[PDB]
Ligand binder design. Structure first.
Ligand SMILES: CC(C)C[C@H](N)C(=O)O
Lengths: 100, 273
């Protein structure tokens, strides 16, 4: 078979405003096999309450899933999503950029 | 317009860790309406849309028992394919299936299909005639000859032309589709030296299909534009953006265009400081 490397986007549900509660998403797509480990991190530390959508797959057979967590952005806090998957030698970390 | 009823099936082995995980998901018009997840003590087919609770307990017992039977067949299939490919018993493997019917505006069958994959690659597919099979490798050829000699394509043609269209014809029948128009805005970001990034956002739209472009003097900037893949907000709506790098002070020479089926006409917008 094949392995497909996950594609990752990290972004908020609503346009971010400092001090206002929001939802941070980690949208992970285009991967195979379906087993995957997704963590969300605040200032380098794992965020406990991360919810996972049900997994789905596309017409090309590759899987996708949405991880999400409540968060209240501030000017200086850093958020990231880290994904471990057999297609990759090491876990991939993608940082939240509030402009993207 | 057309309508679709499709089922997406996944079976994943996990040797040493327990029984394979099995999932069936039903979609009407690319929208999830039923799901069966094997990962439970008493797994049940569940409704996933607001209209499916109309069905009685007779419907759910039959579909649950159907899905449990399918689950046990795919458990066997996973073992069968280890034999066909001469793979060891220790590894995890995945079988996937897409099965369904698409009908036109007139209620006639447009396309019926049944497509299988193994570990992310095409395995076997029922052809459009609904009478013959295309096998992707010499393993799948073994399945093909078995199914040709068992009247499987006959059993499938009768499901796809018969029961599928019948269930589809009555499912969500309520036939017309939701649209939520995008709201758009442009943001402005600094770049090294004498350049700036303009980013055109579309938010809160449904369905996902959308096009964003940037124009300088009437022509679309295909080459220089950065795009993200369309992504879910998590509330049912989608997001997308497109950006371009432009000279400092020339921001008003660029126009974002947003095209979406929900809009009376496309949005045009510029950076508004
Ligand atoms: C993967 C499945 C389509 C395998 C099929 N049931 C066979 O035994 O050949």
């Amino acid at each position: 078979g094949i392995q497909k490397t996950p594609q990752i986007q990290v972004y908020s549900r609503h346009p971010p405003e400092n001090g206002k509660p929001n939802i941070l998403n980690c949208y992970v797509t285009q991967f195979h096999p379906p087993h995957i480990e997704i963590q969300m991190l605040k200032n380098g530390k794992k965020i406990p309450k991360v919810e996972m959508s049900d997994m789905s797959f596309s017409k090309d057979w590759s899987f996708y899933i949405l991880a999400h967590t409540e968060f209240t952005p501030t000017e200086t806090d850093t958020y990231a999503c880290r994904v471990k998957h057999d297609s990759m030698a090491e876990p991939k970390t993608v940082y939240w950029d509030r402009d993207m | 317009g057309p309508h679709s009823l499709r089922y997406f099936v996944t079976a994943v082995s996990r040797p040493g860790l327990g029984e394979p995980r099995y999932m069936e998901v039903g979609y009407v018009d690319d929208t999830e309406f039923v799901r069966f997840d094997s990962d439970a003590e008493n797994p049940r087919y569940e409704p996933r849309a607001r209209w499916m609770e109309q069905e009685g307990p007779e419907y759910w017992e039959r579909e649950t028992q159907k899905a449990k039977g399918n689950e046990q067949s795919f458990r066997v299939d996973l073992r069968t394919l280890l034999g066909y490919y001469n793979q060891s018993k220790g590894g995890s493997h995945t079988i996937q299936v897409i099965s369904g019917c698409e009908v036109g505006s007139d209620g006639r069958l447009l396309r019926g299909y049944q497509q299988y994959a193994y570990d992310g690659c095409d395995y076997i597919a029922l052809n459009e005639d609904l009478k013959t099979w295309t096998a992707a490798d010499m393993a799948a050829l073994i399945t093909k000859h078995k199914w040709e000699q068992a009247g499987e394509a006959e059993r499938l043609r009768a499901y796809l032309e018969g029961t599928c269209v019948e269930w589809l014809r009555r499912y969500l029948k309520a036939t017309l589709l939701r649209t939520d128009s995008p709201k758009a805005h442009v943001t402005h970001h600094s770049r090294p030296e004498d350049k700036v990034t303009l980013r055109c956002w579309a938010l809160g739209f449904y369905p996902a299909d959308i096009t964003l472009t940037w124009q300088l003097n009437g022509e679309e900037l295909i080459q220089d534009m950065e795009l993200v893949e369309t992504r879910p907000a998590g509330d049912g709506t989608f997001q997308k953006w497109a950006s371009v790098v432009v000279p400092l002070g020339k921001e008003q020479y660029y126009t974002c265009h947003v095209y979406h089926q929900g809009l009376p006409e496309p949005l045009t917008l510029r950076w508004e400081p």
